[PDB]
Write a protein that binds this ligand. Structure first.
Ligand code: DJT
Length: 217
């Protein structure tokens, strides 16, 4: 694979969003990945509706503002035959009745791919596909209060993940210096404009390769 990848530089990635006081991280991870794959396919970047996922993907197993899985979101989009745009179905950070309207659908998917649970495989996938949904262990004050540089938490778990985010690339600092470029959903005042550089090739730090996946389109 290349030594560095950054899909943001190719137009694959919407600006950093903010989930607010709703446990919808999984919905932002899933819209991020689908935004990327729709861009790959069509050349058009259109921001997608997390609220549509929050309100409507219960049947697939998601739990609204209480949590969910990116693969269940990808399944919803396939089952449903569409997903509305962010503009048409804006984000409210609370649960409400499903208001999906097929007239405003701007995305589709045909399923999803679960990546092997190794960082080499995750790198392969990022290098070829685009941005990738990942699970991480973000349950640490060091993460909540992260500002700069490559994030490494000695007490991170590779099994107990609690937050869905989006890998948009990877690289290295200087010339234990590799990182994953990770888009969060906590607004642009957290981290590096809303991004974190997660330690890469340090034995699956924080579980970043433990539940990685993307939608097929
Ligand atoms: C986001 N605001 C919150 N976190 C979750 O909803 C996370 C997202 C996924 S994950 O990325 O952690 C994960 C973990 C293991 C395997 C696959 C994935 Cl995609 C699930 N989340 C959770 O916190 C858990 C969960 C699992 C199943 C479920 F139905 C609801 C939650 C505990 C793993 C809401 C804080």
């Amino acid at each position: 694979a290349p030594r560095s990848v950054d899909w943001r530089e190719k137009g694959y990635v919407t600006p950093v969003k903010n989930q607010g006081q709703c446990g919808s991280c999984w919905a932002f991870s899933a819209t991020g990945a689908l935004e990327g794959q729709m861009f790959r396919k069509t050349g058009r970047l259109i921001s997608l509706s997390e609220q549509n996922l929050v309100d409507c993907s219960g049947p697939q197993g998601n739990e609204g503002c209480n949590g969910g899985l990116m693969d269940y979101a990808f399944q919803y989009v396939q089952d449903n035959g569409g997903l509305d745009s962010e503009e048409s179905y804006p984000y409210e950070a609370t649960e409400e009745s499903c208001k999906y309207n097929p007239k405003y659908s701007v995305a589709n998917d045909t399923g999803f791919v679960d990546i092997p649970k190794q960082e080499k495989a995750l790198m392969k996938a990022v290098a070829t596909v685009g941005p990738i949904s990942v699970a991480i262990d973000a349950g640490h004050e060091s993460f909540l209060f992260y500002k700069e540089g490559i994030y490494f938490e000695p007490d991170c778990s590779s099994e107990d993940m609690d937050h869905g985010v989006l890998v948009v690339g990877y690289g290295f600092e200087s010339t234990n210096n590799k990182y994953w470029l990770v888009k969060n959903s906590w607004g642009e005042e957290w981290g590096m404009g809303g991004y974190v550089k997660m330690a890469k090739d340090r034995r699956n730090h924080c579980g970043i390769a433990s539940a990685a996946s993307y939608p097929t389109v």
